[model samples]
Target chain A: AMGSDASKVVTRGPGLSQAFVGQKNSFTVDCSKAGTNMMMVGVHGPKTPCEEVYVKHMGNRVYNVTYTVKEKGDYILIVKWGDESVPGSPFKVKVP
Target chain B: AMGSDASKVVTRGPGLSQAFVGQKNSFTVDCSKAGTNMMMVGVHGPKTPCEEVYVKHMGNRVYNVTYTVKEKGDYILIVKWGDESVPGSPFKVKVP
Candidate 1:
């Protein structure tokens, strides 16, 4: 339901899929200009389970996001900051 | 030294700063009532470097924050939820 770009928080990170099990997978988020929007990170795979997912503030509106997979399957890495989701979120994680 | 408040979110611990160079420092924040606002944390001083920091959702709007001092100085630990500053923030810390 999130559409448009004017108000979207900008982000850049690793391609959202193809990570190994038990390794810490991470990315970065930038929200300096968004000005007061809730940010969140988590995982799921429709059914593929996820473990140790989290988000952290780095500095100057930049953040370091991380998570780990334990099962060899596909997972979804989601980052929600407000009504409109940040681009490059809901990452695709394929644990092989 | 800038502003103050303690309305929605609550916190605990003297775990704001003074982190060991190789140790992980942390604290917790409850934002169940803060709504959709940015939860940010960082450490810095007049010239001190801002360490690597981040937050993890522990469920139900409860979050755990982490950072590494890397060095030493008077660090300012800031936790901002929306525009209002959480109490005990801008936490003063001297690495020992």
Candidate 2:
């Protein structure tokens, strides 16, 4: 922890959310800057890719995603983009 | 930074993801163009009101999203609309 790159911190902004149980939420990411293989998406929780995922790609760097919540609760959206050694920062969205 | 549209720059567009959690991550939104009320639904993130979102009656936008990760994480969804300038464009969602 002491030797860690203090300057390199997790970057996150206000997460996205949606109302109703059948609304279609949309968003876009600029992946032209991040490494190709470094980009990965995680939903529900933070974990490695062992099970299958539901992700749609819009090109080499761009992606399209959609999900619907049945019960009433906040959901999370996470994104990883960076080096293979340490992994990249994360972005998230909390649904109501 | 000073004289920006500083006019209207809250436009966002790819951030949805889901993988192997339950296998079914469907998303949808209900709208009636600008000015009308709205509702929304997503996998996770944030908190909002209504059961829908108002949309453009004359034009349709492009919004396709999906992403997934194992282990389970965060998720959310939101939506909003109204005559109040502070209420319009308030629909949103977040997921992990």
Candidate 3:
């Protein structure tokens, strides 16, 4: 299980609360804070599979999460490690 | 060594050829073509930490890699798995 400290994982960025249709919205995730773990992102509010994701590891298990959504609406972004949610999972994102 | 088949990795997108400042540039990487491997991107022409990356796996090991840059200039977008460069990698990108 890699002793996953998923609960210690943290995510933050303005993108979580608001977003743009054509531009990029970003957030950072720190996995080193907890331990060895992989982060996953998912959307459950819009159709069309309009969202894109990229995780850039800045170092020390800290990663920069950037996402681009093609639609404008309410979206629930699930940021988690396996089945457990990070500090801010099931994020409510409003892209207006 | 995960039986690393790093050479078979592939990358593509218009963003790799041309880019725009204040906007996101993108490229896609396919890992399923060969086997299980990890993709990493690096920028080696900009001084500022102005570039952002997002790699969204659309399943089947295909990924949508998105990047955003804050400055207008030439950039070398290195798409690789660990240390090996993918196809068309070490790409000379023109941001004009």
Candidate 4:
């Protein structure tokens, strides 16, 4: 739950949500330091989807991504930077 | 010169080279595990340059980047992933 401040990793998103067809969802990633960093965000329910619907890099330390579920199922949103998952990553989203 | 088999890191480049103008050089990174990973390749000498020229992702685990020096100076090439740096990283590149 804690990491180096230089390599600070944070994300903004709706952790718990009612997944519905055509439901708009989005998240943001912010890094504290500037160097070489990597971000991996995906949805895992049946299989991990490696597609980014819309991704934008704001400045040099912030990034935004959006996703919309097309099928009815439960999913876990995974957000990671470097080797460890960001705090509150792998959030749960249920659709009934 | 070793790391986790799942998180293997390797690079290819001219370690020691003459700092000649218009000389093109490159390096590659390979990861074994398929998950969330990060890569930081930088040049430190007069200043740390955090720019990747000609970066390409091959399949899901390989990454390549190229760099060219304009001024004559000694530089250190740093390569890191996740929390730990790759083997043989922070290589010394002498440019005379």
Best by DockQ: 3
Q: State the weakest 10-residue window (summed lDDT) of model 1 chain B.
A: B42-51
Give the higher-TM-score candidate: 1 or 3. 3
**TM-score for chain A as predicted in candidate 1:** 0.77
**Candidate 1: where are CA atoms >4 Å away?**
A1-96, B1-6
Give the DockQ of candidate 3. Answer: 0.12
Residue-by-residue lDDT tens digits, candidate 1, B1-96: 122233677876556746677677788888666554445554554443445555666765567877665566666666666445687776887776
TM-score of each: 0.50, 0.32, 0.51, 0.44
lDDT tens per residue, model 3, B4-94: 4667777778878888887877777776664544455555334333346666768655778777666677777776553456778778888
**Best first by TM-score, ranked:** 3, 1, 4, 2
Which ranges of candidate 3 are over 4 A from the true structure? B1-96
Cα lDDT tens digits, model 1, A60-96, are 5566777765568766666655434577765777777
What is the Cα-based TM-score of model 4?
Answer: 0.44
Indicate the worst ten consecutive residues by lDDT in candidate 2 chain A.
A45-54
* Residue A63 in candidate 3, Cα distance off native in Å: 0.8
Give a tens-digit lDDT track for model 3, residues A1-96: 245688888788887888788898888877666654445555543433335666666866677877777667787777665346788776888988
Where does model 4 exceed 4 Å of error?
A1-96, B1-7, B15-20, B33-35, B47-52
Evaluate all candidate structures by whole-model CA lDDT and list the values in order: 0.60, 0.30, 0.66, 0.53
